[PDB]
Write a protein that binds this ligand. Structure first.
Ligand SMILES: Cc1cc2nc3c(=O)[nH]c(=O)nc-3n(C[C@H](O)[C@H](O)[C@H](O)COP(=O)(O)OP(=O)(O)OC[C@H]3O[C@@H](n4cnc5c(N)ncnc54)[C@H](O)[C@@H]3O)c2cc1C
Ligand SMILES: Cc1cc2nc3c(=O)[nH]c(=O)nc-3n(C[C@H](O)[C@H](O)[C@H](O)COP(=O)(O)OP(=O)(O)OC[C@H]3O[C@@H](n4cnc5c(N)ncnc54)[C@H](O)[C@@H]3O)c2cc1C
Lengths: 495, 496
């Protein structure tokens, strides 16, 4: 008795997934998506945050970093003699051209999967209605179900003066027509670390402002190695120190600090966090119960209004990740229309940080596993080592960080770790890898864990040689045994 | 019994048995010696994988991998790059790192309390062996003996001018000379891999293939590899072997089985390997050796029950490092530390490091179609390009353009699951063609082994953006007959 079966307010990963899956069932779908311009005026097309100002551009930026390293460390050692200069402006061009492809690419995929895209803001009018603008004339449509999927945007703190007026965000940094030069990043979140990662690797004086600890939430050992690697590679780290003032001194940005120090940067980037973009939705009036944290309350993807659902960055007590959006979004479209009652096993969500060395994992940090099971049912088997090709390169620290005459070597680029449970035959509850291609490595092993692997199964695993992944077949050292888990020997993670 | 265990071979299998056996206060001798290659090459401790196998090759492959990115990628990511290449320096990096490992290993044996001796061994009876010392032959006795002398290349003695001229996989990493224009005879994993880095590193590289590429492995996956290498300037003479090789001045002229002729500055026989067992003096002792020369010991135990075998010399087992090692370790456990364990040879992963790497565990589409028939078999797969390379728009060299939209190198990635209808779609085949195959294949080898089903795979949460996440969204099938090409080109996985 409603104009539609399903309306979706948000053209993001979660958004477009639910829409297309819902449409695979002859069910009639509207989708809204409009890009409110950033605090610095930046704006873009269809696909959401992952296509535009997220995972897609990110990785191309990381890739162009990973390249630049090999060039500087590896190219000659592998017998390739090289000049190379870098133009920000062209890297941008490659991003915008590929992203443009995807914006278009996606519009089409919605049309072809038979979904009515409308480029316009939506605003909840009641349990089954929404309001938008059309030619600047406000029209209203009605649905059996509605999906909120609006994503978030960056939080620039309003108590630090000269932030909003000047500082850029994640939404602007892939597409600066201007190389950002000497750059302060405020954040030791996955984004900040990643973003201060490629600026450095791409040869820009990069400082990082860490209020306390790096990557709050993730496993401590693994995060402490990442920071150690990034210091070694020319990223500087002001811990316990945030900005308290930001001002324009000529064509530079002077940045007063909490400890009582000052510094000038050509570009400043607040990576401090994100707030769900739910303010224009008009929630509370409809009756959508939202947390103290602004995030919406809907842990089975269903709000306080049961004709209304939510997914992705906006819903509380779930990771903010693209595939987590998608699975939930697909399922919700199945559960409703195609007789299903599957929900995501949240106990098993892999992720990977693409820091200059990548960190992947599934399940519990050593810390979280020590709590749930106590430091007696907990055994930490690990091996820290160099991947063969990089062992051969003899990668060195930049001069300005040398302390002695045999100080040349970067840290070993890998660390593998399984955390397992004495009282469940050493059942595996934590899988963690710091290295190149951590995600490519993390993936296969996420499913073995989720199929209930033990250390027994791991050691009966036969290696692929040479790989860094094979180290998992021969972890024997332990935290409890206290002895050396280092492996200088360039045999690798197996023989 | 002067000893508890003697080992003739310092290879992967060899050194593993030794050092595990030694972890039990048991007294261990270990022999090595490197009989010089048909072209006079020789090296130190560690075996074929350290010296003239997986170690050097991966560094050579990496230096290739690099060369591509430089030529295809660098610019698009905004790095403008001049680059010329020095064969002699790549060598130097190999030699120096391998030297590190030769030494590195000696120490690991000493420190794990094992008596390494650099000289040839020769069986004298079920419990005795003979070597040379100052050129004076000395003899020792053991409770058990382990044969694992590895293999060496097979250069065919029927084709004239082969042995005197052609090189092998034991020469190629250390050539004092850049090989230039190179014929490789064999589309085995070696030949393919080796013609892979010579090409990527810019040497006119032809491959001479008696029949089909990578005999044994899954056909679709092998056919993509060859297709990718043709696209990148490797040439391929099918159904044609050499029948004559001669030195025409300072080049090598190479007459063919079809009639044709060609000159190379290099020929390399990758046609296979034979177990290095002829000097062991086996049959006299009573070691039953197969029609294939390989030894018969499928429980690592020979016809003489005081005598064992492991690695490339034992029959009906894959020619691999890790299979050597675990078998070698276990046998040292089974004997001396009260153990009953054998390798599950149903689940041995592998990765071919071709310009696109191919990994897999379990059955080729073909092998699964046989065992279970074309009804109980479902082939779910996806062809696509990894997002980084999608952005680069890698294009073909001009001389291989046939039309105006002929620019494309093939998609670099193919994922496939083979599963069994009648066991709830239980997964019996895992196959991946792309970059960081092996890195991808390994994790997935164990999940498969633990009895992953298609449903477990589709309920898998993904990491984005990776190529490996494609395994969480394979829906197309060979049987459904539809296109398995990428809806867009957004990595390996979709952003919604
Ligand atoms: C720098 C960065 C790197 C990241 N890297 C990764 C990564 O590597 N892997 C990963 O899995 N995730 C990554 N993410 C996270 C990923 O971007 C999010 O998990 C994902 O984009 C969330 O999708 P969503 O459907 O919730 O909406 P989003 O993808 O957040 O997109 C929201 C959309 O909602 C639309 N919208 C909002 N309000 C309205 C309205 N009123 N009417 C109509 N449309 C509206 C907007 O147009 C917008 O396009 C990254 C994020 C960032 C910022
Ligand atoms: C080019 C190439 C690449 C390869 N790549 C891979 C790969 O990527 N992955 C993989 O899993 N496998 C790979 N392999 C296979 C792998 O090298 C072998 O399966 C494995 O190393 C065999 O070990 P082994 O102990 O059986 O023999 P080997 O490792 O060859 O060692 C045997 C040793 O015995 C010595 N010896 C011989 N006769 C005597 C004697 N009378 N007395 C004393 N010592 C003696 C030999 O000289 C040698 O040092 C590759 C092989 C080659 C040639």
């Amino acid at each position: 008795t409603f104009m539609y079966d399903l309306v979706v307010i948000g053209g993001g990963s979660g958004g477009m997934a639910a829409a297309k899956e819902a449409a695979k069932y002859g069910k009639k779908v509207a989708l809204f998506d409009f890009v409110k311009p950033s605090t610095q005026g930046t704006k873009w097309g269809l696909g959401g945050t992952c296509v535009n100002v997220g995972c897609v551009p990110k990785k191309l930026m990381h890739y162009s970093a990973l390249i630049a390293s090999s060039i500087h460390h590896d190219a000659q050692m592998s017998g390739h003699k090289t000049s190379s200069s870098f133009e920000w402006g062209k890297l941008v061009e490659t991003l915008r051209n590929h992203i443009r492809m995807l914006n278009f690419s996606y519009r089409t995929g919605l049309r072809v999967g038979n979904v009515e895209y409308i480029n316009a803001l939506a605003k909840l009018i009641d349990p089954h209605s929404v309001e938008y603008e059309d030619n600047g004339q406000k029209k209203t449509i009605t649905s059996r179900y509605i999906l909120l999927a609006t994503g978030g945007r960056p939080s620039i703190p309003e108590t630090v003066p000269g932030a909003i007026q000047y500082s850029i965000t994640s939404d602007d940094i892939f597409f600066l027509s201007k190389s950002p030069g000497k750059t302060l990043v405020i954040g030791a979140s996955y984004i900040g670390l990643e973003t201060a990662g490629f600026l450095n690797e791409l040869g820009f004086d990069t400082t990082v402002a860490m209020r306390s600890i790096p990557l709050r939430g993730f496993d401590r050992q693994c995060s402490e190695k990442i920071v150690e690697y990034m210091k070694a590679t020319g990223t500087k780290f002001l811990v316990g120190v945030v900005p308290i003032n930001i001002e324009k001194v000529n064509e530079n940005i002077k940045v007063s600090f909490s400890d009582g120090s000052v510094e000038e940067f050509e570009t400043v980037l607040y990576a401090t966090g994100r707030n769900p973009d739910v303010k224009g939705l008009n929630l509370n009036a409809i009756g959508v119960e939202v947390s103290d944290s602004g995030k919406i309350i809907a842990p089975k993807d269903a709000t306080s209004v049961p004709s209304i659902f939510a997914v992705g960055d906006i819903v509380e007590g779930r990771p903010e990740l693209t595939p987590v959006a998608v699975k939930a979004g697909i399922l919700l479209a199945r559960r409703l229309f195609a007789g299903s009652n599957e929900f995501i096993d949240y106990d098993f969500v892999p992720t990977t940080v693409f820091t200059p060395i990548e960190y992947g994992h599934v399940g519990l940090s050593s810390e979280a596993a020590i709590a749930k099971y106590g430091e007696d049912d907990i055994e930490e088997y690990l091996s820290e080592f160099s991947t063969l090709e990089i062992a051969a390169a003899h990668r060195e620290k930049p001069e300005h960080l040398r302390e002695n005459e045999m100080d040349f070597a970067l840290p070993l680029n890998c660390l593998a770790k399984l955390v397992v449970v004495k009282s469940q035959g050493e059942k595996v509850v934590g899988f963690h890898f710091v290295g190149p291609n951590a995600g490519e490595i993390t993936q296969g092993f996420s499913l073995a864990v989720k199929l209930g692997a033990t250390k027994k199964d791991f050691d009966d695993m036969i290696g692929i040689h040479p790989t860094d992944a094979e180290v998992f077949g021969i972890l024997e050292v332990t935290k409890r045994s206290g002895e050396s888990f280092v492996s200088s020997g360039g045999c690798g993670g197996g023989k």
